[PDB]
A paper describes a structure:
CMP acts as the leaving group to give the cyclic diphosphate reaction product MEcDP. In the BsIspF/CMP complex, only four CMP moieties can be modeled in the six active pockets of the two trimers in the asymmetric unit with the occupancy higher than 0.7, one trimer fully loads CMP substrates, and the other captures only one. Although the two trimers in the asymmetric unit display extremely structural similarity (r.m.s.d: 0.20 Å), the B-factors of the active pocket in the two trimers are quite different, which may be the possible cause for this asymmetric binding. The CMP moieties reveal similar interactions with the protein. The cytidine group of CMP interacts with the residues Ala101, Pro104, Met106, and Leu107 through main-chain atoms, and the ribose hydroxyl groups form hydrogen bonds with the carboxylate of Asp57 and the amide of Gly59 from the adjacent subunits. Residues Thr133 and Thr134 hydrogen bond to the α-phosphate of CMP, waters act as a bridge between the α-phosphate and the magnesium ion. All these residues are highly conserved in the IspF protein. And, the overlay of each chain between the native and BsIspF/CMP complex reveal r.m.s.d values ranging from 0.12 to 0.24 Å. Moreover, structural comparisons show that only a small Cα r.m.s.d differences (~0.1 Å) occur in this region between BsIspF and BsIspF/CMP complex. In both native and CMP bonded structures of BsIspF, magnesium ions were refined in the active site, with the ingredient of magnesium ions used in the crystallization cocktail.
Residue numbers in the entry:
A (entry chain C), B (entry chain A), C (entry chain B): 1 to 158
Write the structure that this text describes.
Amino acid sequence: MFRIGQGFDVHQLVEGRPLIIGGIEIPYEKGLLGHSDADVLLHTVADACLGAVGEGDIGKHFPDTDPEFKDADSFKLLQHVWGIVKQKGYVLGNIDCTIIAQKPKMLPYIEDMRKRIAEGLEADVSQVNVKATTTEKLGFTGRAEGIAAQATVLIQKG
Amino acid sequence: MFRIGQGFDVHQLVEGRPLIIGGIEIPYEKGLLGHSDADVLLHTVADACLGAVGEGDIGKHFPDTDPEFKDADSFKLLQHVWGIVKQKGYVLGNIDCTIIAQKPKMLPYIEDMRKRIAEGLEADVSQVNVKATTTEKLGFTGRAEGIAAQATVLIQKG
Amino acid sequence: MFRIGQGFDVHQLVEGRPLIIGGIEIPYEKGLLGHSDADVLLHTVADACLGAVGEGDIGKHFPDTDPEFKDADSFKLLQHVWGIVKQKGYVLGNIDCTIIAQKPKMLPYIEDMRKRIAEGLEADVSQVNVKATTTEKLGFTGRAEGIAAQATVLIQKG
Ligand SMILES: Nc1ccn([C@@H]2O[C@H](COP(=O)(O)O)[C@@H](O)[C@H]2O)c(=O)n1
Ligand SMILES: Nc1ccn([C@@H]2O[C@H](COP(=O)(O)O)[C@@H](O)[C@H]2O)c(=O)n1
Ligand SMILES: Nc1ccn([C@@H]2O[C@H](COP(=O)(O)O)[C@@H](O)[C@H]2O)c(=O)n1
Ligand SMILES: [Mg+2]
Ligand SMILES: [Mg+2]
Ligand SMILES: [Mg+2]
């Protein structure tokens, strides 16, 4: 028994905020805006996992209206989600993720995001892939108004 | 033994159309524009299903020019597609879907969508997940010009 | 055992380039811009396959700045990627792909695309699905500024 999940998220890039993607703080002059730390990649990972076990989405579990979510660490949120997945009787098969951003260049941070995600999913780094693509200056990600992310996850009984 | 499918669709939001998403009519002052009822989520689910079995996309079976597509009920189209899947030997593993819309708030209608999708795929509600995200006012969805959806499906022999 | 991968890519449409998609030259008045042939779909497929086995993305294996990338045949880049996948001990389960493009109409070239991708992944055509959608004239794909593609792949031990 295998189950699939998919996640998609978008956050605005703005002046007065830290950039945290995949649990890793990137030195940058813009960061992501949200109620929590706005880590678009960990929200997308969390969404894919919840999706795979039929448990809705991060908004159902950590709504904005509740200020426990306010400035929440999304790695801790992911850990809570992974708790739900474990309770269903699953472990990670593998995950594959895409950061969609014109800038910054994510390549130097990728290996540390893979480790961090793997730690949050209680898995080996070889089960976690993270990649990045621009949109060649097209669309809202192309004009650097925001950063999007996608993930697909395969989980299995264990 | 297993196959994966992925679907993506976009419809314009316009005055004077009903809003039908996931087979559920949602009261709102705009609806989706199409030749059919323009149920962007059911079109996405149908496309993921057809994708999983190597049968093309909804346009190969129900082109815009087919008089049957005009005002077609997308749930019925989904049933037709699911008959194709079943003839190939497959049943639903699980499906995970995302509505990409700035508004309306999808949350109250999610559980009815899940039940309707599950009925179309002859499956338990536990096998179906639907979630929603905005794009934080960015891009065409952020301007409420349209609604998009994505789905990933895992099917298995049965 | 099974592994999942997901790809996404975008290239700009510009005058005075061939349009090559899914390894097929499509006669058209614009083509895709890149250092390589800029085949957005074969890039997307390659990234999905690399993702499935935890090997990063095409830029970690075939960076922009590599002279062999300049005017590269993306079918040959796919065959190399597929080499890596086989080296890790996997074969194709199935793959589902979507071209996102306002124009041209892809339908006539879809069957030749499927055969080419199946050849690239050492698979039967029945394991490969290629679809197209527009975005109803919305966003960068809808204004014909570029073409995007998505792919989800399921690979299996063999
Ligand atoms: N159109 C929408 C968009 C989001 N939602 C829900 O609201 C939450 C907040 O969405 P955003 O994070 O995109 O603002 C989501 O996690 C989802 O639970 C909704 O119910 N309808
Ligand atoms: N924001 C980004 C975008 C792309 N990249 C890298 O650059 C490579 C090529 O990306 P583009 O072709 O999208 O520009 C990617 O495969 C990825 O390795 C990155 O490291 N950070
Ligand atoms: N560029 C495109 C876009 C769509 N199509 C086909 O047209 C059909 C309908 O596309 P839209 O509803 O996205 O316009 C699709 O289901 C696909 O069969 C195509 O052949 N080439
Ligand atoms: Mg988020
Ligand atoms: Mg549609
Ligand atoms: Mg490319």
